[PDB]
């Protein structure tokens, strides 16, 4: 079906509520915090639409189709252009279903859970923001534009870990839970720049082709293409919880329970596995990494 | 349970008129409009109240099912064509099989609900772990975390009668909408959004009196 040129509204669907609460939460703090439970409805509904706009986007893929992608140039300056946009391939629809379902469910569970609390509205804003950022990450065309969302979900997880911001442990766990995936995104960015220099492009349609087949012989870059990919793998490790970087999940579980259930099935697994699964076309030329991944696993 | 007796608390549907005495205004959505006095006796009153609530809810569902797919056809990706002609649409099975299955399941459900109406509380689904006391009923509002898991029909989000007023008013409006859609398709041969846009373009002439 042609229901793609309108699919870009998926990662931007809940946003028209977030900015319409934070403003109220900053300018008029004593009014929005009096429409307490009502604010749950305009969110759990909006995100809901996304879900029913995703199954019809995924059922198509089940019936057999071809993946699309849309690129737009968001910089035209002297010597080099930058692109953005998304793509809808099987894995995208898989993770889309898996994020929107658990999201729309944990929203209601949070309405039940955090009903005696005080930061009701702020909590809902954080949840919706993390959700609209994750929905963005999973549908993203070129590497730079997935890095743009990686660190966003990292910051969302940070703000959610130290949520109550007053328990003197939840104030010492958020810092670690940020610095670890900060090291991770450091490795991610270094690997991105490495592959950029090596191949000259950023998007998958060109990276998968160039990096696999055409590349010079041992001008030392071979050691670089062995090294640089290890950095992307390190990032995908650190966003998940593997051996060298796992010290942030056990203590990060200090946050509220619904968040503890959304950062252990929605982002902990997605931002970790999904990236490796999408970049698999690269790693088949590097048996060393194929073995090191299995070993760390 | 809050009462809305005569006075400023009673905005009469017909200004300058005393509403019928047996129309107190307890039922949300009341304005003292029963010139035919069908609600004269209380048993008929409650029966008609139940009928009104059921009609309103079913009409809301029906008008949603009409509206949303047609607009998602007009501009959205998938093109759901004329809903009035979707009644004869061709599926995996024949319409009579669908009819008999619908009738079986809906008979089961609506019969349980019928017995609940005739005998309140005697047919209810509300588990009871020890020491946690369950809620009662107000038939037409079953309660418990089966049909109120958001805990909206009890207190906190809004005084009850106000929310029930919202429901009954929107339901009357949706009944009007459904009968309007059907009557239009009797007269015209398009959907609701098509008539809507045709009226937008030419408000002065593109109307019922256009022919």
């Amino acid at each position: 079906e042609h229901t793609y040129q309108y699919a870009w509204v998926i990662p931007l669907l809940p946003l028209p509520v977030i900015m319409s609460m934070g403003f109220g939460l900053i300018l008029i703090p004593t009014a929005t915090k009096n429409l307490r439970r009502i604010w749950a409805f305009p969110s759990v509904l909006l995100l809901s639409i996304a879900m029913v706009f995703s199954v019809q986007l995924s059922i198509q893929q089940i019936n057999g189709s071809s993946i699309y992608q849309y690129l737009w140039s968001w910089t035209v300056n002297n010597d080099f252009s930058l692109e953005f946009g998304y793509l809808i391939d099987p894995l995208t629809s898989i993770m889309l279903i898996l994020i929107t379902t658990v999201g729309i469910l944990v929203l209601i569970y949070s309405d039940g859970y955090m009903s005696h609390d005080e930061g009701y509205l702020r909590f809902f804003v954080y949840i919706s923001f993390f959700n609209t950022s994750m929905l963005g990450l999973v549908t993203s065309s070129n590497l730079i534009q997935i890095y743009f969302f990686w660190e966003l979900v990292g910051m969302c997880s940070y703000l959610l870990i130290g949520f109550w911001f007053t328990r003197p442990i939840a104030a010492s766990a958020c810092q670690k839970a940020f610095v670890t995936n900060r090291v991770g995104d450091f490795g991610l960015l270094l690997g991105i720049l490495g592959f950029f220099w090596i191949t000259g492009s950023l998007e998958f349609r060109d990276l998968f082709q160039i990096a696999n087949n055409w590349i010079p012989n041992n001008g030392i870059n071979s050691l670089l293409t062995t090294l640089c990919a290890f950095l992307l793998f390190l990032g995908a490790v650190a966003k998940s919880a593997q051996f060298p970087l796992h010290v942030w999940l056990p203590d990060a579980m200090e946050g509220p329970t619904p968040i503890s259930a959304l950062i252990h099935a929605a982002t902990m697994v997605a931002a970790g596995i999904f990236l490796l699964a999408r970049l698999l076309p690269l790693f088949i030329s590097l048996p060393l990494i194929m073995s090191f991944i299995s070993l760390v696993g | 349970t809050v009462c809305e007796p005569l006075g400023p608390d009673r905005p009469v549907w017909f200004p300058g008129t005393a509403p019928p005495p047996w129309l107190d205004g307890s039922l949300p959505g009341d304005f003292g409009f029963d010139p035919l006095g069908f609600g004269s006796e209380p048993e008929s009153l409650r029966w008609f109240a139940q009928a009104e609530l059921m009609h309103g809810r079913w009409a809301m569902l029906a008008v949603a099912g009409i509206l949303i797919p047609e607009i998602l056809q007009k501009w959205g990706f998938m093109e759901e064509f004329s809903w009035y002609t979707a009644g004869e649409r061709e599926y995996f099975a024949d319409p009579w099989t669908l009819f008999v299955t619908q009738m079986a399941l809906m008979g089961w459900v609506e019969g349980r609900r019928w017995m609940d109406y005739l005998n309140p509380g005697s047919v209810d689904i509300e588990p009871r772990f020890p020491n946690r006391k369950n809620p009662t009923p107000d038939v037409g509002y079953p309660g418990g975390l089966w049909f109120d898991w958001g805990n909206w029909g009890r207190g906190s989000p809004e005084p009850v009668m106000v929310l029930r007023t919202k429901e009954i008013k929107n339901g009357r409006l949706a009944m009007l909408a459904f009968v309007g859609f059907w009557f239009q398709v009797v007269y015209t041969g398009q959907g609701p959004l098509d008539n809507l846009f045709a009226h937008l373009a030419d408000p002065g002439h593109c109307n019922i009196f256009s022919a």
Binding site: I108, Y109, D111, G112, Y113, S115 | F129, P130, N131, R132, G144, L145, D148, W149, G150, N151
Partner: peptide, 11 residues
């Protein structure tokens, strides 16, 4: 002397 009764109707 109390008891762990059920939670709310929303969780």
């Amino acid at each position: 002397f109390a008891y762990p009764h059920e939670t709310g109707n929303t969780m």
